[PDB]
Amino acid sequence: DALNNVHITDEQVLMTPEQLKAAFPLSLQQEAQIADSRKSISDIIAGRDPRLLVVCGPCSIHDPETALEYARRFKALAAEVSDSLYLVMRVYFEKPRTTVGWKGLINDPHMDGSFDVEAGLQIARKLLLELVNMGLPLATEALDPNSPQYLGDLFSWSAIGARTTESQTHREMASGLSMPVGFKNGTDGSLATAINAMRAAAQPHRFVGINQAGQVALLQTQGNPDGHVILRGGKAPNYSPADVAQCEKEMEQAGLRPSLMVDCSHGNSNKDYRRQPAVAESVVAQIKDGNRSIIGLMIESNIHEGDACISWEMTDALLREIHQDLNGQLTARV
Amino acid sequence: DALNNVHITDEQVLMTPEQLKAAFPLSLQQEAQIADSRKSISDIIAGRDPRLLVVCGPCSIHDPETALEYARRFKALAAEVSDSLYLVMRVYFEKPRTTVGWKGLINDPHMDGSFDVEAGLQIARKLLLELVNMGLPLATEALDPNSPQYLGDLFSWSAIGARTTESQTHREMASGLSMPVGFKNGTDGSLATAINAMRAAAQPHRFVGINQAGQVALLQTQGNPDGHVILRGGKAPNYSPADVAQCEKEMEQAGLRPSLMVDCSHGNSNKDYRRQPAVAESVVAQIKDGNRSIIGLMIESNIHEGDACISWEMTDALLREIHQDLNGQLTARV
Ligand SMILES: N[C@@H](Cc1ccc(O)cc1)C(=O)O
Ligand SMILES: N[C@@H](Cc1ccc(O)cc1)C(=O)O
């Protein structure tokens, strides 16, 4: 053709969500465990559970074995602290916002720039199934309408940022996701985008995505009742008590019940791993001081540091310190 | 299902690109016309055609009749300046840059929050076909891997921004597009993203999109040889002679022959319509003083003024004045 596919040499129909799930299905036990973790995170966000939601893990998943080692250490740490903190392992296969670099375990699993999406999807789903069998709740970030259909049944929490809310085809996708959702503030620091997205997510909507057969589809949503804001900083950090108070005020003026998670990383640490514990400790001080809107923390943490990810030893010490400082000023708030 | 589509109430398969094009096919005259306008734009970008490429039109399309009214004036003006300026009408249905508001003619053609994408696609393609039959080359912006399959056969030029380059599944989509492509600089003013994307677009690549049957597919690309940079400001405008010289320097240092278009709007006018003409005039001055890299202009222009769109009268006066000023210096470059 003179106009169509002039610069396309080949086209290959991808494996569908149907086929991926049939090749790597969930067991009844795994399904029940995931539903229960989603319910627990919903209860925490809604204030019915006193514990603090801690989404912690690597900046981006590198390979299955390292992720499993981190998961072993993380589950070990979580069993000791779960009476005050609900640890959820973030499994991000890719990093937002790059013109450059490795495309991640799903797109380039062989790590040679070959773009083998189909093998990456199977590797990722197998790894996620293994993580679920370890008893770990998993956290993701929604960046497109396709990956929820392939892998969303394995996650208990999702972050929503500008890649969703600034599209028009699927800006309302959060209202149709089966998991609790946290809405990141604007890159400039605007809370309005996150607040509007959180309010809209509780309502029925329609968006363009795919069906289980990999076909472009129009989806009608029911509304997602489990939403909260994520404070991740803008040009300047926004975790301070004054910024938290401003967030609570803007949420209350929107008619929402103030519920927010503090990202200790990117915009509140300014890309430096050394600042994350300071943000976490400021949040702990605020919770001690009768703050009730802060429902969770986000922490970027690898086995080693240096990346804005803190080392595993720092993560262990920090989570233990938070648990010791958060004695029962969290049962105080139910 | 207790895990899948909990908050989804309905799902229907959207009309495929195949079916859309079967319902609203291109006549062979329009096909040859679009191919010829693509070739002419490619010639301008490569420096074979001395004329200046001018992409100009509404901030976004409001409804079909307003678009047609604009189009008749724009075609009339294009006829009278066609020896020096090659006019291309920008037809942007979606806006980038929002989380609230009207979803545009494609998603909400009834403009009542209905999200009737299937009717919007047909209305949009009907409008585009009528615009093509008026003899107007058309310009779009690629914000999505699916909309090119539905409507790209009607466009002669496409802008490429962060929505493409800062995804990791279709970051190379431009290398597989059948039309010349302009790469916008980063929001911060960084030229590296646009330059790297422009270089990568000339190479064979792979990206995830859809086939003509609406199925998720992996596309292998041949490479797109018709690329240029779009200067659209950052934290400050970047159209000045010093900024253009720096862009030339960075492009040459990347191995690219300097070829750029100056956006007289968003970052370069500070979203103040009153400043758009000055920008354009500056570009004119630079060409009169020996510039060889500036190949085009982009102008946001509607029937009425202030949106940072300029009025049609401002547009007409500005384009005529540019045409008067440019006559001889353009053939002297090639
Ligand atoms: N299946 C997803 C919802 C969804 C459906 C279609 C999509 O394209 C994206 C997401 C869930 O249960 O959360
Ligand atoms: N059909 C487009 C190329 C394309 C193919 C698949 C996509 O998902 C997107 C774009 C063109 O000819 O320009």
Swiss-Prot record, chains A, B:
Gene Ontology cellular component?
cytoplasm
Q: Name one GO biological process term.
A: chorismate biosynthetic process
* The entry's keywords: Amino-acid biosynthesis, Aromatic amino acid biosynthesis, Transferase
Q: Which reaction does it catalyse?
A: D-erythrose 4-phosphate + phosphoenolpyruvate + H2O = 7-phospho-2-dehydro-3-deoxy-D-arabino-heptonate + phosphate
- What Pfam families does UniProt report for this protein, alphabetically? DAHP_synth_1
Q: Pathway, per UniProt? A: Metabolic intermediate biosynthesis; chorismate biosynthesis; chorismate from D-erythrose 4-phosphate and phosphoenolpyruvate: step 1/7
Q: What is its EC number?
A: 2.5.1.54
Q: How is its activity regulated?
A: Specifically feedback inhibited by tyrosine with 50% inhibition observed at 9 microM tyrosine, pH 7.0.
Any one Gene Ontology molecular-function term assigned to this protein's record: identical protein binding
What cofactor does its activity depend on?
a divalent metal cation
Q: Which family does it belong to?
A: Belongs to the class-I DAHP synthase family.
Describe the function of this protein: Stereospecific condensation of phosphoenolpyruvate (PEP) and D-erythrose-4-phosphate (E4P) giving rise to 3-deoxy-D-arabino-heptulosonate-7-phosphate (DAHP).
Q: What else is known?
A: There are 3 DAHP synthases, AroF is feedback-inhibited by Tyr. The other 2 DAHP synthases are Phe- and Trp-sensitive, respectively.
Q: Which NCBIfam families match?
A: aroFGH, PRK12755.1
Q: Which protein, by its recorded name, is this? A: Phospho-2-dehydro-3-deoxyheptonate aldolase, Tyr-sensitive
Q: Which gene encodes it?
A: aroF
